[model samples]
Target: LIKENMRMKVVLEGSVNGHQFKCTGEGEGNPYMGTQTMRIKVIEGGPLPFAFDILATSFSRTFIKYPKGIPDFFKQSFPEGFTWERVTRYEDGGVITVMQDTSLEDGCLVYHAQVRGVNFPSNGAVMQKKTKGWEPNTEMMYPADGGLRGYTHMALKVDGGGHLSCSFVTTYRSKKTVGNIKMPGIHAVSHRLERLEESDNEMFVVQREHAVAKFA
Candidate 1:
């Protein structure tokens, strides 16, 4: 009786190999079910750096509800936290496979994603590798106005190279249908690439995107 269905739209801009790229896509889902699909097209910059596209189809595997209480770390952001929902969704990707697990601490949403995928070089043969660590590294935050309008971090190792660090910000508005028919979805995301070496770091202003998607 809680989850509602909705549609999503997103527009993105990023730089790859010193060239700019833009994309737009759509999706629909109810997060409680964890069944969602999305397709993105590289509208601008055709085959400059590389011909890139994405199709993600996901289905729910299991749902876990915490009874005693959520972890102490969750309370760091959601101080008044009371309960939690863990939705395990398996995402089949066009170029990769991901365990796109999601956790809901009251109304705060966090994506705990792990990926096993190919490594696309700037100009070289493709490589595949296993999934490494959990993304976002235990960060949590409640969205403003019932939506995310902030940034987060994720780190993973490349198949044949060093680790790739990413930081991004997302802002979205979940529309209202009737009085209280609000839905769950991803509407906007912008990313920046960073390089991580042992005990050190370097930054690259790459992969920034924006989205305006609907859920109903």
Candidate 2:
């Protein structure tokens, strides 16, 4: 569980539409709410490199309809915090998959977008070091940001009225592979995200200037 003023930094990388991108983010808060921020850059498959930053707060909303049909084992496995089972969504002719440590720093990473896609995987890591050092009282000790592996999915959307929306998904991996052998690691984590696109409620916008102007 997250405590007051707990802080963490995350780095994730992946590709969408064959364009590679990377994101570095950070979060801080109590068990209820706090702040989150990230800087993302398109690293490959683009004419030139471009990057942008987002700053926002993490808050819980009971109104978000928790989709039905989650497996019992998925919640039982992590009884203390709001961990999630793999959830899939079919929207706008796209298939998206999600899993996450919802009680962790997720509120900060979520985003929304207007893009057509398929079978996208999103992950979240629950076990990482403090932005600076080892946590005072934890089950075990691991290097900063060095633990389990997983990935994340982010989407950003805007409406006709110019309102913005964002959502994110995260998945967890329980074990580690040593070149060939698999072994259990410290805990679960989210490591990457893909299907990134610059958008405005209606369509995917490819022009960097438009994206920068819209975001600006």
Candidate 3:
């Protein structure tokens, strides 16, 4: 490897119910700064494992998985369903908490999260562009509890030897409550959680967030 850390930036466009958004994501990576907890398991356990990458090119994005393993933990617990929560504490003291309710036996993807910092341990700085809150032109149905509107997908990857791959997308309408500047835009997320056979209620892996700013 020629370098330890590298950085890049891009602007993306997304639309939900006529709510179109454009965001700039600045990202950084290194050989050692891999997925916080995930990179380790596949390394230490060395049994059944899964690998995937998110490829974002221009206006199109793709999720790809290449693997040959069944994390027995999920296989055993999924029959009755399960719940998981992850609390991430940043040095800037911005904590992002994610709680998930998964079918366990059946999986895919769903929603629920975002951030409050310019500093991260692994990934470099993420400076989001400031925009007009959210254009309140198109009306849409959203969670009244001020929660999330999410969906999940779970499919047996026969291509990957019967193992399961899951993903979720969650969205919400936003109204700026407090700020010198607040734009009525939108907050959202999409991610996957890995269910290690023996993981507890607090531990899991894989997550992708949505927002210029949002909650877990």
Candidate 4:
């Protein structure tokens, strides 16, 4: 559950398109219908525009619809966000997936992209340096990964214009993430959340997340 003025810094470390990248951002989660600014950018040695474009591109692939599915189960998008299932889409060809945490956080959809392999380690300890100490002035925590490879836990809110800002953490089950694949794999979607009454139950926003990426 995100409260007003709820702010937190996120670190996503992993590989994407065979390139290494690091991304960080901080923004308060606004419950009101305001344009929440989640200024997320990559910490790269290259130009900003290049970095941003890669990030958005990777994200778009996750949900980017196409002829081939990112998953073998579905050849198209999900039936909906309410059925006990995740949503699927096609990019240029392969399917992209996004897990919607409808139970809480309102209807923020979390994205995790992976090829599947061994268990990935957690990056919680490294987050300590920035937070100051155990009892810092902010909140910090890790997701539950019993045993899995690497994946970026991307989280975002669905307000008017959709993803005005976003947050995420990349975790490798056994070993720490390489911080390359996760950076350029995020897409900040910006679709207006005006259709609040479109569904009898909770709904997941599906669109291109270009509003929150680019190297510039």
Candidate 5:
């Protein structure tokens, strides 16, 4: 039932810092809960890109109902609101470059981006934590080494009716501080396409179904 501009519902089940959690609000009503949507668009001289738009809504009970001090650390970590900039075809075949402007925020410098192929749902990878100032904090921390080493899996399907389905998975590890606590953790996040029967808008669900085990 995948089609162009067709919206689908998705369920995300994962963990944070080893704690299991689930997002069951708004977008959870159908498959696509939030206002975020993924669309297929063709570029003038590049591969088709699956544009992704995510709207932050509700936080899980675990994230919300946690002790006030616990959540406060997260708010302090991203004070200026996570800002991301996109640069298309700035270098190679095609790259939807993303630069995280954490200058106004806290900690050291950090940036990450996902490079897409010239085709929708083509091969892609995430390169992150290329900051010099933060090396001292992450040298022997969670990430162990310094960079991420893994391959992501991407799948794209198109039905005869024009419905498009896309899914991807990225896994990596790093040593960093969450609030005042310093720890090393591994993370894996997956995004999948779904069809919502009630709404006309196509939605994309970002489920944090992974883990970050802190070392003591």
Candidate 6:
């Protein structure tokens, strides 16, 4: 049975970018590449309720070339202010676990949540990155700024006997112009539960994989 007072750790790593035509374009349309890492520490406080904290997180971006020449418009526009949390509850006598986090720092209040059940081999993760173009009332934007687009994808793995693992991916884009010249960039992210180790003493380690684009 999934008992209370259990502790677990989770890590995620991945990359993101906006420039999809970097290889084919004049290289001026290249996307920014970066790496993101997050560590979550969770402790079960009750039989039907729990709490978790974000131990640490790191995010860095690099330009493909001409680092100094890179425009500040893109960097300044990047999202900020983020937090991570975990939620647990009892669903039909079984435990339900969820992990949630922020997408951007200052932009659109983008957030993602992953949910799973303790009684089945079920695990899942979700990621949603939004840009300036995302609107609450519109299903789609007209003449969208091709660069301000969002991407989301997820994977699920059931190992049987109530054990499961999942992964999520997302990407965002931006465009900058210096004088009359325009440059486009892409940011792509891939995050997953790399490893999960449980001990008899009620401790676990969850390794994560993070990959970025052309930068670091």
Task: Please report, in order, the local distance difference test score of every candidate based on alpha carbons.
Answer: 0.31, 0.25, 0.25, 0.25, 0.23, 0.25
Off by over 4 Å in 5: 1-76, 80-95, 100-151, 160-181, 190-216
Ordered list by TM-score, greatest first: 1, 2, 6, 4, 5, 3
* Cα misplacement distance, residue 107 of candidate 5 (Å): 20
Residue-level lDDT tens digits of model 5 in 81-184: 23323333312132333222222213222222222233222332211111111000110111324322222222222223222222222122222334332222
Question: In candidate 2, what residue range of length 10 has the lowest lDDT sum?
Answer: 207-216
Candidate that beats the other on TM-score, 4 or 5, i.e. the better one: 4
Residue 92 of model 4 has an lDDT of: 20
Model 3 stretches astray by more than 4 angstroms: 1-71, 104-124, 127-216
lDDT of 3 by residue, 94-135 (tens): 233344333311132111112112122222111111111111
TM-score of each: 0.35, 0.31, 0.23, 0.29, 0.27, 0.31
Instruction: Please list the Cα RMSD from the true structure of every candidate, rounded to 1 decimal place.
Output: 15.1, 16.6, 21.6, 19.0, 15.8, 16.5
TM-score, cand. 2 vs. native: 0.31
lDDT of 4: 0.25
Best by TM-score: 1
What digit string (tens of lDDT, one per residue) describes model 1 on residues 1-216?
124453444444444334555555454445333333444444665443332311111211111111222211221222221222222112221133333333343443333333333334434321132323223232223355554343345455434554445433433233222233132233222222221221111011112121212211
Model 5, CA-based lDDT = 0.23
Off by over 4 Å in 1: 1-3, 14-18, 48-137, 142-151, 168-216
Better of 2 and 5 by lDDT: 2
Top candidate, metric lDDT: 1
TM-score of 5: 0.27
How many collisions per candidate? Answer: 5, 25, 18, 36, 20, 25
Q: For model 4, what is the alpha-carbon lDDT of residue 77?
A: 21
